[model samples]
Target: ETFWNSESNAELALTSLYRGSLTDGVEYNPSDWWSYHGMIMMEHLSDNAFDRRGENNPFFKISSGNLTADNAFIKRYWETSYKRIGYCNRFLVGIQNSSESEKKTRMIAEARFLRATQYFYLASYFKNVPLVENVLTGEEANNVTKTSQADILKWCVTEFTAAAADLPRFSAIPAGEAGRACKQAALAFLGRTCMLQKDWKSGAKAFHDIMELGDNAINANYQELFYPSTGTSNKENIFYIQYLENYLGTGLPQHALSAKDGGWSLVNPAADLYESYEFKDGTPFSYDDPRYDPSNLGKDRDPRLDYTIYYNGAIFMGTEYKMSPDYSAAKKEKLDYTSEASRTGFMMRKYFEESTPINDVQSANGLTPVIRYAEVLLGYLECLVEDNQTITQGILDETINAVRGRASVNMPPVTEVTPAKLREIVRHERRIELAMEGIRYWDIMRWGIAHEVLSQKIWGAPYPGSTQYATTTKEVDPTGNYRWYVGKRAFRNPTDYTWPIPQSEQNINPNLR
Candidate 1:
């Protein structure tokens, strides 16, 4: 208890909550639920990406609808989340009996905020997880019953609101302390928590407060938002996980890059996600369109498409990405059709550091965004539209338009349409704007479209007329493009939406079962 008795000591302990755990025996660290690698893998559980390791990979099992309570990833994620929550509980209790200061109050608020985030993760994944608010004895832990997800979200709302009241505003925080929890971040989470419950009024109000704060705005460069060189200083990042070069870094580049780029190419950008990007003229992309060119797919499309994905003929790392099996046998080893290459015929380009060499990607330190102002704008719009508010031109310009009209991403501005159309527009905007950032799974789940989207067969980039090398099972599109069949997924309505409590937990605590 003496450890937290001192203000400085308490501050030191608080810092530990920010440092994520490395994956056991791996060069990567996806163990932290919010880590870049972890979140990217989470995308694999959705339609945006696919894990190449197939059934052996836990994420693949879950994505393919083969998830069971004993899945290793499920168990590890649950245990890690609760472990972090336990640390927060210990810190909160230890600091309570100490002499109080203004700083101490803020520190306590930060701790509570961190604990609420853990609960958010738990409630999002495991819908009926036990909510441990304070440090609990092993006996107490084993005896606790599951808390309804509704109750957990409500608790998150309360905790985030309280933390917001005590925390400093983004502008008020010092340059030296950039990544610490701020008032806007807490309120953003508050808005997100309300969003989970479809509490439109409260969610709208929380996001509106953030908009009025004027501390954040859309970063001009959509592509640069994920790069460490320019991303860390961007005000658009409401909250992000900070990493230091050569020290606390991420393996995202190693996993996201291609085989030729010296990466394992674990995360394959799905063809569904590739086709989701709209044309620069704001029309939906389709193979039947006259403008569609299988030979040069990136031309005249959403500039974000080229920025986010590496398709055929796309220049990456000063080399053209060749996914065709028709390439020479020597080059076939490095092509996308290989087991080590991107199985989806598409590679992620969003988070890749252009300057980081192959050898340095294991320790590539790039800031990973947890929440951004762009998401806040979209969330606010969803709240208003879902609440059946009138669709106004000004509202469209302020929210969705603001995101689309970012300097580099100057796509056509969204005009006011029917409320139904506006709702569709907002959701579609969220998908394109936040594509590979790890928020798509939550959106599909909350929107109740996971069943519709995840149940379909997953596909890769268009491979025209090539039936060789097991691309034989490809699906032909209206324009005669052959989409590489990657895998199939099944999302059983309510059961698959929420992960089962890990069996390991059930063995020790019967209450969880």
Candidate 2:
């Protein structure tokens, strides 16, 4: 109670709310979804990536349609969210008694913003979650009932809108205070919150305000947006989790790198994601196309594809990535079937820091993006299409086209088209443009396409014939690209859309049942 008596202490309390789970070593817990590693691992829950650990992996279980109220990750996510909310509530109350200062209003706003973010995720994944605004007594906590997802989301929208008014803009933040919540951050999230309810008007309004702010832009260098050194300067990132070397580093590199590079190779990119990228000239990619070259799979492909995935011939950490079983003699450990290697024959290249030594990936201090300007642009475009059923060339030039025209990712501009056609184009852009950044799963869910996409069999890279690792051919397309079976996924309707309240939570609070 006395801890928040002073302005300095109130600030300290707010700082504690920003704490991310420890992810520095192999002993770290993987279930903490707030951590950078956990956020990246979220790709496993969708068709974008696969978890090689299989049944033992909680994310794998959920992705494979084995989700239950007893799932450890579902339980952990619920527990952690409420725990953080409790802290925020306590801080919010304590700050009311603190000595007044110039920073008090902004501090309170920041705390509310943080708290709303927790609820945002809760309502997103669990739907009907308890909306506990105040720090509750034990008895009160036990009796609280589930709130409708609609109400919870409305609360988030209100909180973010309030926060945006009190929070400082990105440029107004003092030096050395990067990663703190800003007006733009709150507005961006407000826009996202509107997306969940399909409130296109409100979502479009929030995004339009952001566009008028003109304080952020798409980073010219796509890959540089993930590197800590370069990414900090890129205005594209409106909100990101910051990491300090050794003190609070991410295991992203450890999970994304290849086995030969001393990484666990746990996060495997699915071949479906690889095949989704379009050519440089904006043509759909196919193995039968005249531009297709097996020896050089990346040739004339979407530049982002090469930047995002480490394929057979791609270079990484000063070595060629040879995952084909045909290279087993020379690269035994790197063969796709190897225990520690990528099961999907593809490793994520995005966010992999080459400067970090092979053995020190756990200590790589790269910033993981939570929200970027590119998303805001695409989201606004979505709003226009969904709300009006039509769009103009000028709007396209400002939104989707602007994102594609980034210096590094100079894909051809999208022309104004039918609402239905533009909708698919925007969605496809969202998938590839934001691929492997832990955003795809939510996109699929919100679009009601999870069942259609996740229920199919997952595939790996084109099967190289005569590999030592024997596996049945999953399918051969008309183009003769042999796909290797990776795994199966089933996303049932209604029940699968929102996770069941964790069994343990219901055990404690009968109201939850």
Candidate 3:
């Protein structure tokens, strides 16, 4: 095959796995959602964020529980994953009999790696799916039967195990091979599958493999980890979907999070999410906290919050960004409740850069960190807690504390606690640590808490002046302002956690049924 004969096609073979065109052959509409690891689209599907313009936005519909089995976006995500999986299998089948050269083996390994990643997404999003590994004829593909989640998870674990063996460590990957899959990436994903299936023992072992890699650890500088230019050097990144911007500059529009200069201001962080961050002293960060004053809203808050979200009164990019109209009046632009503004009065800051203007979708050049060392650390912590293992201080120090101890984020140490408490703590840490990374929605669903936690109100700022953001629900903020309203979030237990095999897919192949 031409793909096997040429060294140049090797990268192409890998990147072809991410070609996410919908069935209609159009660039993803809103087109902007593709940039943020595709997680920008995912945020609307969960509780962490909301779509301000509910004009049939898929994420907004999913958030408000207006989901139907035949939704177009759901169908697209399912179709895109399988289409990519087919490409991976085709690459593998083509290269199977090629010379046992290093390039051929690594490429095949990467194929398996990508194939497993797609399967993981499918299994996480839809618990049961056909685990197609080999290239199939059209008839065979049409008749392929659905597989149980248990079988799919086992297959993913096995695939990752084999890929990790053939793949090189992150350090071993050549400078010229910057974005290729590595041993740590494989292991990290393996751990991810284990955690999703609640196989704590296996999960812990897989992540422990990553920890033993020594150099695989959190990047000390959390703030720089999101900048397109600066964060690329982040040591904590295990696997990332690399994007480059030039000319019209097509990449993630993280700039859309801000409305400073024509930013779409599409996704709004949940208000409770803002309150979830705690102070450095381990005291719950409340409006009553000394740091709640307008002058220092970010003071005493979790440093990661500063890195993760652009809060109402954050000091960022040489200015204090406030969500309230009062603070906005003091600045050049008012954070008014206009149509283009954030509904929750908060915007994402993780992948943004001060130098990048908020006008162009292609301005985003940051790589999407698919699997990072911090997640591996947290996954390990979750496994330990889940298995009811001894929650030793040393273990806590190495796992969760190591993540918290990143430079400039010296949060308090975890006091020795029971597994039950530690389990809750690890879950909380996962939610906060991985905020805006597009992993929390699935996380809560996997933990079976989506029905409980996601069914409540998703609130925004109680700004003094209401441009009729929503109907009335009285709530006093820490600033003694009564402006936020509680809105019901939708979650249809089994149905929401389990995505329906799209009717379009079933029509294409009745075997999906």
Candidate 4:
């Protein structure tokens, strides 16, 4: 109770725990984690998942607006998340000195989750990153040794496992405890972490472990899990970054997708990404389903598609909301790579919050979700399929199709079984289902398909006449088969697959190089 008494000075001292923290973890404040949120945003906004590239877009150009040489993308993620990890370790070791005692267990759980999340981020993008398990003092951090990737993975597993026990599983927790760390969140992350480490059975077990509490396993209300367009609803949100309106309200990955706001829409769905979806008749676009309705952008396509992106002249929200529906035209406006046309020629809609108007200046939407029920199921499906030799079509229907039904994607529940085909289908399903929410890049990496898959010219499907962020104006794969397929650009090499380990981390820790 008294911990709140001397917060002002405590926060200042706590900042020593990490690069900066409000009273460090000693006083306990949500704002401290806000600094780490930038990484969350970047992973979705700039990564390979669902990308957009045009003359003015930041993602493609070496020195563009959002994704560039500007170290904020790299620096903030590296420095801040590690800083949080430092604080978490500090809190874990230092909490005994905390004035408040009741919050101790929960705070420790929170610290584990924070550190675990940081390691997870590092592992996902930059393969073989160093691990930090304790709050290194100034001198220690100044001369710390870089831990091997295997070591880091083991540490992440350890921390998350410890977290699961200390953490309160969703149902065991009470309402009004939103945003606080809990057990399900820890286990979900453990599942993903193990899956990434190639411990398929363990990963499946972790996710499946959470599934035993079936009701909590589901985020049944689709739109509301993300948007208010559906209405007021709250189920289990295992873990999410809490963003409020006045913290200088800003657009989301959704806002990034929206042309309604001033920024060029970063995400126009891709043809490869688009073809992954099924037609009204429950057939995939690969079948050449005429009902595939490949209009330029927004012209009575899938309802989920309508809800997801904004095309050049599409009437968003309703006819009253007239906007560009031409996917191609939208690409021109949305993309900006300085001089050259962005390779993908589209903006991402992952954090798109259409409600945020360009001129309104402040965006005050609710916080964005980082991990949720849907992802758990998808991760579960991934593990079940990959870790096991025989994940039947029935499991696909149970895991993936259930989500399809929720999204209203018209697809007959696949009931048969084929390991090879199911792999392809599940991979495609992940791209579409997760899309701009930023899981694609990692998934592709896990499947070991980033290079070849990317080399193929990817384009956004058309809503009207043209495709969104299209590559070739006239569409035939001339070089190989029948038609001439135009490509914007080729992979510049390794940079797209992995980022340079932050120079700053190397400098601070002599062992890093």
Candidate 4's C-alpha runs over 4 A off are: 1-72, 97-102, 217-221, 228-232, 253-264, 286-289, 292-302, 319-361, 389-397, 407-410, 458-497, 507-509
lDDT per residue for candidate 1 within 1-513, as digits (tens), equals 567667888888888866645532224435777776567567887889887675456767765678899888777778778888898988888888889789989998998898898888788878888988878988898888998999999999999999999999988887789789999999999998998988998999999999999999999999888877777788898888766655666667666777678777777788888888898899999888888888888887988888888876788888887776555535543334346777777888887767655457666677778889999999999999888888688888889999999999899998866888888888888988888888888788888888889888877777774556354444444334677777778778777888899998888888887
Over 1-513, each residue of candidate 2 has an lDDT whose tens digit, in order, gives 766667878777777787633445442334345564457777888889988776457667765677888887777677778877898998888788666765999998998998999898888889998999988999889889889999999999999999999999887876488889999999998998999999998999999888899988988999988877777787888888777776666666676677668677888899889899998889898877889776776789999988888777778888888776556534434444436777777888888666655346777677788889999999999988888746889989999999899999899999957998899999999999999898888888888988789887877777545354354344433345766667777778766888889998889988888
lDDT of each: 0.80, 0.80, 0.70, 0.53
lDDT of 4 by residue, 1-513 (tens): 354345443444343442333221111112333332232223323233233344243343321222333443465456656777776676666665666643556666666777788888777656566676766768877776656666777788898998888877777666455556678888988988897788988898888777776646344544455553222235545666554454434334333434344333433444454444455455554424344333443333444555554444455433222232232334343232321222233344334334543333234344456667767777788787777657766676667777666644554565545666776767766666665554555666666665556555534323233343235334543332221122333434456555556677666666665
lDDT, residue 350, candidate 3 = 72
Q: Point out where model 3 deviates above 4 Å.
A: 18-37, 247-251, 288-291, 294-296, 313-316, 319-338, 355-361, 462-483
Q: Per-prediction count of colliding residue pairs?
A: 0, 0, 5, 58
Q: Which prediction has more favorable TM-score, 2 or 4?
A: 2
RMSD to truth, every model: 2.1, 2.1, 3.7, 6.3
Show model 1 residue runs off by greater than 4 Å.
20-29, 328-338, 356-359, 465-471, 474-479
lDDT of 3 by residue, 249-359 (tens): 434453354555435666677777777888877777676556664445456789887777776666655665656544443342444434456666677777767665534
Better of 1 and 3 by lDDT: 1
* Candidate 3: Cα lDDT at 180: 78
